[PDB]
């Protein structure tokens, strides 16, 4: 049960951090989806060739402790994405609001 | 009494100088205790007037929740008073220490969407109230210990040290007499 | 085990703090709340307040401030720290201000 | 391209460039904050643990010895008092000797970091430590340990700290 | 203050002072370990180095423990022990053990009419070994989710504390040097096993 909740969480963090890269790059959703990589290889190659990373996640620990190591790192990536996305979106909003005051009525200009 | 009744001798001087250094040390440690208790007392007084300015949010929201809920359901208070039984939020007493004074504190432990919103909006209020009573049981207990400590600092300064100094001045005066007789 | 919390309030803040899970009635069938309905005799809001004040099972007493004020006599007379009396706000009667029985210790300081 | 630091003192830009190429994906693109420096905060191991106690991200240790050699470790966890060894295999030792060398995990043992009231040390495998420091941050020692298969990190096995810094990514 | 005492302490190399509080509390011999002195401790240094080797470090630590407790005892009278650190509870409780079960000696009973120096060094070795282990267990579990205390040690080690406080009851006229050493060495093993098990 604890892993089933944790999978749905990290799959969501993967979808968020992928979606926000498409919102940043803008050029086309298929080109972004083609230019996703894990360890510098295509995701189909990454999954097909999987080997556990002993350094990031220790084998000789309990299944519970390994699960918590993965959960902490995913939670950090989620928080740092939220922070960076908010800070970048503010510039994008402000620059567009200056453009909206170059546009508009002779009253508002 | 003006003096400690000890009979004049170089032994009596040695004892009364040991009492003087004892009392002057006791006063300085009790002055440190008085400050350490007072620093905590002037801290939790800020926590009290701060927490009471969150009641003016969480009770408003709870009151609006109750108006909306009784408006939605027609009634509760005719029956949810009468339905009372063994019940699910309680207090465990627990302890904190400040300069060797022990302070009592409390620990909360726990045994349709509009009603669920009301249950949230009241449960988050009893989490202020069981905190604020921890601050008020601390504050009222800490005020007492400052008074007892300041009274000892005053008694050592005004009552105990002067009686030692009068005794010690008498001993020196009587030893000059014995020397002049000899 | 642990103490209860007790409530001395207008009927709407005895539905509040009861839909909040506070408060029982004991083996003797003594309750844990009082309801100051508009025709309440002034003695009642002391008569039970003294019963809470010297029971062993009550840890906190929550009182709407306007009916602490009806017993400001009996309520400021509580010098101990054993049951903590919180003077909570009410509905249309104004919120918690000055006149609180515990804050007054800091007279030259708050 | 070179990273952003909120100050610096033991590292010149050619040290920053060569370290920043090697740090893990966890900490690439984060600004570096000075958690502890003997030159800012006074010199003791109790101060180093006190300044580190609030942290919850990796750290870089930088040491200059009295022979002016620069060396240290990158560690996955802050330096804290621990009953047993702690850390993970992204930990590494490094030195500029004068060329830059980095000693990543051998895979042999997990003796990465151990902290005591009177010392801080990294590595294990018999009586060896890749890096050990005393309570004063005055004496240290380095020898090859099988956790990292490192060289001597200093000019000598036994050395005196000239100055020391702990950086965190935050 | 007396002219005879003032003249005598200008001459003699050893002085064993009394404490009237120890005498009134019927602690014997009533010797004051904070005003007594010997000026032969450097002269005897080669004898202890040749014949005993272990002792001078034990004596040194014992005199530190007894002075540290005299510094603590003046303050706990004012502020009632509640602020006292676990190392300092450890210090008071070993100072009591030394005072009551080493420095106290009944001169009118077969086992302690005369304490030989192997019995003396053995008892002090075990009490100072307990202090080293007990203080290490407390310090080495500060900054931890599980923290050792004097009370945790006392609850775990009451039979070791009973054996230590009982080391004085060995009779050197009935029990040989080899037996008394073997018993005291078994108590060190029992201490080490008990602390390793904590």
Q: Which residues of D touch E196 (CB under 8 A)?
A: none
**Which CATH number does the domain housing residue C73 bear?**
3.40.50.10580
The per-type count for chain E, helices as H runs and strands as E runs, is 8, 2
Give the minimum alpha-carbon distance from A54 to chain D in angstroms, rounded to a whole number: 7
Strand-by-strand arrangement of the C33-35 sheet: C33-35, C4-9, C58-64, C84-88
E82 and B101 within 8 Å at the Cβ level: the answer is yes
CA distance B143 to B17: 35
Determine which of D88, D109, D111 to mutate to test the interface with A (most A C-beta atoms within 10 Å): D88
CA distance C104 to C97: 12
Looking at the DSSP bridge assignments, the partners of residue C87 are C63
**B97 closest CB neighbour out of E75, E78, E82:** E82
D110 and A58 within 8 Å at the Cβ level: the answer is yes
Say if CB D75 and CB D93 are below 8 A apart: no
Chains C and D touch (3+ CB pairs under 8 A): no
Is B78 in CB contact (< 8 Å) with chain E? Answer: no
B25 and E74 within 8 Å at the Cβ level: the answer is yes
Determine which of B127, B131, B136 to mutate to test the interface with C (most C C-beta atoms within 10 Å): B136
Contacts of B150 (CB under 8 A, 6+ apart): B34
Domains (ranges, CATH) in chain B? 10-182 (1.10.287.3240)
Q: What's the number of domains chain C is made of?
A: 1
Instruction: Please name the helix (run of DSSP H) or strand (run of DSSP E) that holds residue E14, with its range, or none.
Output: strand E14-15
B6: which DSSP letter? P
Determine which of A37, A40, A55 to mutate to test the interface with D (most D C-beta atoms within 10 Å): A55
Closest alpha carbon within chain B to C109: B42
Chains A and E touch (3+ CB pairs under 8 A): no
Looking at the DSSP bridge assignments, the partners of residue E15 are E37
Q: Which residues of E touch D81 (CB under 8 A)?
A: 142-144
CA distance D167 to E17: 59
C103 and B88 within 8 Å at the Cβ level: the answer is no
Query: Three-state SS string across chain D, please?
Result: CCCCECCCCCCCHHHHHHHHCCCCCCCCCCCEEEEEEHHHHCCCHHHHHHHHCCCCCCEEEEEEECCCCEEEEEECCCCCCCCCCECCCCCEEEEECCCEEEEECCCCCCCCEEEECCEEEECCECECCCEEEECCCCEEECCCCCCCCCCCCCCCCEEEEEEEEEEEEC
CA distance E124 to E138: 21
Say if CB B99 and CB B33 are below 8 A apart: yes
Q: Which residues of E touch B36 (CB under 8 A)?
A: none
CA distance C64 to C62: 7
D90 and A73 within 8 Å at the Cβ level: the answer is no
Q: Which residues of D touch E142 (CB under 8 A)?
A: 81, 117
Q: Which residues of E touch B99 (CB under 8 A)?
A: 79, 83
Say if CB B143 and CB B40 are below 8 A apart: no
Give the minimum alpha-carbon distance from D110 to chain A in angstroms, rounded to a whole number: 9
CA distance D38 to E112: 57
Nearest to D56 by CA among D86, D79, D38: D79
Name the neighbours of D, counting chains with at least 3 Cβ pairs within 8 A: A, E
Closest alpha carbon within chain E to D49: E143
Closest alpha carbon within chain B to E77: B26
Is E178 in CB contact (< 8 Å) with chain B? Answer: no
A56 and D107 within 8 Å at the Cβ level: the answer is no
Q: Which residues of E touch D116 (CB under 8 A)?
A: 140
Contacts of D74 (CB under 8 A, 6+ apart): D19, D22, D23, D24, D58, D59, D60, D61, D90, D91, D92, D94
> Containing domain of residue C60, as a range?
1-110
Name the neighbours of B, counting chains with at least 3 Cβ pairs within 8 A: C, E
Whether the CA torsion A60, A65, A68, A72 is positive or negative: it is negative
Q: Which residues of E touch D50 (CB under 8 A)?
A: none
CA distances from D32 to D8, D13, D140, D168, E72 (A): 10, 14, 25, 6, 46
Determine which of E83, E84, E88 to mutate to test the interface with B (most B C-beta atoms within 10 Å): E83
B100: which DSSP letter? T
A56: which DSSP letter? T
**Last residue before each gap in chain A (C to N over 2.5 A):** none
Is E173 in CB contact (< 8 Å) with chain B? Answer: no
Binding-site entries of E for ADP: 28, 105, 107
Contacts of E154 (CB under 8 A, 6+ apart): E93, E161
From chain D residues 62-121, the ones with a CB under 8 A of any chain A CB are 88-90, 105, 107, 110
Say if CB C62 and CB B59 are below 8 A apart: no
Alpha helix (H) residue ranges in A55-102: 63-102
Size of interface B-C (CB pairs under 8 A): 131
Say if CB D82 and CB D113 are below 8 A apart: yes
Nearest to B106 by CA among E197, C81, E147, E144: C81
DSSP B81-97: TTT--S-SEEEEEEEEE
CA distance D90 to A69: 14
Exposure on the CB side of residue E34, measured as CA atoms within 13 A: 11
Phi-psi category of residue B173: left, alpha or beta, with phi > 0 → left and psi -120 to 50 → alpha: alpha
D117 and E144 within 8 Å at the Cβ level: the answer is no
From chain D residues 10-39, the ones with a CB under 8 A of any chain A CB are 26
């Amino acid at each position: 049960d604890e892993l089933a909740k944790l999978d749905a969480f990290v799959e969501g963090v993967v979808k968020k951090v992928a979606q926000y890269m498409a919102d940043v790059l803008e050029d086309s959703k298929d080109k972004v989806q083609e230019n996703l990589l894990a360890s510098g290889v295509d995701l189909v190659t990454y999954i097909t060739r999987f080997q556990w990373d002993m350094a990031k996640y220790p084998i000789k620990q309990s299944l519970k402790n390994i699960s918590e190591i993965i959960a902490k790192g995913v939670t950090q990536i989620d928080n740092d994405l939220k922070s960076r996305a908010s800070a970048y979106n503010n510039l994008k909003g402000n620059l567009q609001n200056l453009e909206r005051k170059n546009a508009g009525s002779l009253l508002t200009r | 009494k003006d003096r400690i009744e000890i009979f004049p001798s170089r032994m009596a001087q040695t004892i009364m100088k040991a009492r003087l250094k004892g009392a002057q040390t006791g006063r300085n440690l009790l002055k440190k205790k008085s400050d350490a208790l007072t620093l905590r007392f002037r801290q939790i007084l800020k926590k009290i007037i701060e927490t009471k300015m969150l009641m003016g949010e969480v009770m408003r929201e709870a009151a609006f929740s109750l108006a909306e809920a009784k408006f939605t359901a027609g009634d509760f208070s005719t029956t949810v008073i009468q339905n009372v039984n063994k019940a699910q939020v309680k207090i465990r007493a627990k302890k904190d220490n400040v300069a060797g004074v022990t302070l009592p504190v409390f620990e909360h432990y726990h045994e349709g969407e509009q009603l669920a919103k009301l249950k949230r909006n009241y449960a988050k209020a009893v989490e202020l109230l069981v905190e604020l009573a921890s601050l008020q049981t601390s504050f009222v207990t800490l005020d007492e210990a400052i008074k007892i400590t300041n009274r000892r600092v005053n008694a050592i300064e005004h009552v105990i040290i002067p009686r030692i100094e009068r005794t010690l001045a008498y001993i020196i005066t009587e030893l000059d007499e014995r020397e002049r007789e000899e | 085990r642990g103490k209860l919390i007790a409530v001395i309030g207008d009927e709407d803040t005895v539905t509040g703090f009861l839909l909040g899970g506070i408060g029982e009635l004991n083996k003797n069938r003594h309750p844990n709340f009082l309801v100051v309905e508009k025709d309440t005799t002034i003695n009642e809001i002391e008569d039970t307040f003294r019963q809470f004040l010297n029971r062993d099972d009550i840890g906190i007493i929550l009182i709407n401030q306007y009916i602490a004020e009806m017993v400001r006599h009996a309520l400021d007379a509580h010098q101990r720290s054993i049951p903590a009396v919180l003077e909570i706000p009410s509905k249309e009667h104004p919120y918690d201000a000055a006149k609180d029985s515990i804050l007054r210790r800091a007279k030259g300081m708050f | 391209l070179p990273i952003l630091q909120s100050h610096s003192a033991l590292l010149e830009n050619m040290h920053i460039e060569q370290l920043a190429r090697r740090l893990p994906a966890r900490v690439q693109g984060y600004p570096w904050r000075l958690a502890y420096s003997t030159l800012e905060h006074g010199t003791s191991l109790k101060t180093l643990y006190r300044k580190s106690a609030s942290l919850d991200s990796p750290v870089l240790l930088v040491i200059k010895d009295m022979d002016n050699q620069i060396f240290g470790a990158y560690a996955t966890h802050p330096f804290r008092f621990s009953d047993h060894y702690y850390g993970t295999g992204e930990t590494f030792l490094y030195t500029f000797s004068p060329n830059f060398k980095v000693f990543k995990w051998s895979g042999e043992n997990s003796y990465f970091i151990n902290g005591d009231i009177s010392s801080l040390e990294l590595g294990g495998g018999g009586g060896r430590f890749g890096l050990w420091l005393d309570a004063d941050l005055y004496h240290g020692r380095s020898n090859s340990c099988s956790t990292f298969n490192n060289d001597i990190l200093s000019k000598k096995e036994d050395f005196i700290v000239q100055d020391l810094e702990v950086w965190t990514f935050e | 203050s007396d002219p005879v005492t003032s003249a005598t302490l200008g001459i003699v190399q050893v002085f064993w002072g009394l404490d009237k509080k120890l005498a009134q509390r019927k602690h014997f011999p009533s010797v004051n370990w904070l005003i007594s002195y010997s000026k032969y401790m450097r002269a005897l240094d080669e004898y202890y180095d040749k014949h005993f080797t272990e002792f001078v470090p034990l004596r040194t630590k014992a005199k530190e423990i007894l002075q540290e407790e005299e510094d603590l005892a003046e303050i706990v009278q004012l502020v009632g022990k509640a602020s006292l650190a676990e190392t300092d509870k450890i210090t008071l409780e070993v100072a009591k053990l030394i005072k009551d079960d080493f420095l106290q000696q009944n001169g009118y009973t077969p086992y302690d009419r005369f304490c030989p120096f192997y019995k003396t060094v053995g008892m002090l070795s075990n009490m100072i070994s307990f202090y080293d282990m007990a203080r290490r267990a407390v310090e080495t579990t500060a900054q931890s989710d599980n923290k050792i205390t004097w009370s945790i040690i006392r609850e775990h080690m009451g039979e070791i504390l009973y054996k230590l406080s009982s080391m004085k009851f060995k009779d050197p006229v009935k029990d040989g040097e080899a037996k008394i050493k073997a018993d005291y060495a078994q108590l060190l093993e029992d201490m080490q096993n008990a602390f390793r098990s904590l």
